[PDB]
């Protein structure tokens, strides 16, 4: 959008900060949930907690209105195409919260049927441990995503950030090479 054509002066910085504040608030989750993690997501929406306090009570039934896709449960092989379709049918900017161990790495179900982490099919922004994560853990992960969204760049700043993140990522060794103290 034209907000991405703005010059990199103070104008772009203020547009970025206001857009981040606006998007961190009103972060409507998609009406999407796979398993017991979906039950904990509902509990988070439930009175004991209040997802609504964060402007996130409107679980967008359609992906068009959804801004955040809380996977919230295990993703089977047959479901990955559906989850990717839902992700693609959301409109940018989009974010994916991998709620629970099943959504983030497959969790305990390390077998043929489970995808072993939704990042196999959709870009994940935050991983949320737990099986299921208790609602406070979900709110913590959501606030972490809010912090990430606030510092989200735009336009030329976005391009520079992408280049810098690429440069940093090209150098990190794989986890299999962090042999610290391994005999």
């Amino acid at each position: 959008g034209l907000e991405e054509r703005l010059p990199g002066g103070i104008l772009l910085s203020t547009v970025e900060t206001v857009a981040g504040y606006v998007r961190k608030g009103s972060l409507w989750p998609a009406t999407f949930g796979l398993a017991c993690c979906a039950i904990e997501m509902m509990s988070t929406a439930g009175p004991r907690f209040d997802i609504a306090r964060f402007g996130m009570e409107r679980f967008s039934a359609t992906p068009r209105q959804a801004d955040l896709m809380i996977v919230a449960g295990r993703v089977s092989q047959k479901m990955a195409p559906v989850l990717r379709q839902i992700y693609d049918q959301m409109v940018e900017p989009k974010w994916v919260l991998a709620m629970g161990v099943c959504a983030s790495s497959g969790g305990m179900f390390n077998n043929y049927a489970v995808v072993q982490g939704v990042d196999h099919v959709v870009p994940v922004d935050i991983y949320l441990p737990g099986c299921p994560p208790r609602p406070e853990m979900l709110l913590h992960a959501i606030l972490k995503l809010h912090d990430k969204i606030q510092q989200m760049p735009l336009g030329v700043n976005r391009e520079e950030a992408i280049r810098e993140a690429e440069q940093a990522a090209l150098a990190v060794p794989p986890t299999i090479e962090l042999k610290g103290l391994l005999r």
């Binding site: 196999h120 099919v121 994940v124 992408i162 993140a165 690429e166 794989p174």
Partner: protein, 125 residues
Amino acid sequence: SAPLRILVYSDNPRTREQVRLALGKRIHPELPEIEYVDVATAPMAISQMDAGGFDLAILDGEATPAGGMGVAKQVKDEIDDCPPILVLTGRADDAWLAKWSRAEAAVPHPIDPIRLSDAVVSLLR
């Protein structure tokens, strides 16, 4: 001839090194020289694909923040006249998803140099 440009996508630098080792400067002396563009992050890979000028993309299905199969589906849905996509699968059972990603070819981990080279030749031929 035009140096065929290949996009190698993997958060794991060793997977990129293995892919570049299987495919030398020339897969065969009959084929053109090969230039490799290494991308570790999905945003960079997507932007490179949008810039175009690639003859093949090797996407690691095991890439941490964004899997190669997802990126393959995204590029074949978002880039017009996108190049053939080769996906590296972390397990045999991933084959189904490899088919879903519509990748022209799938090469299981660990990357067999010869299997990868043959698949690349088939895709470029």
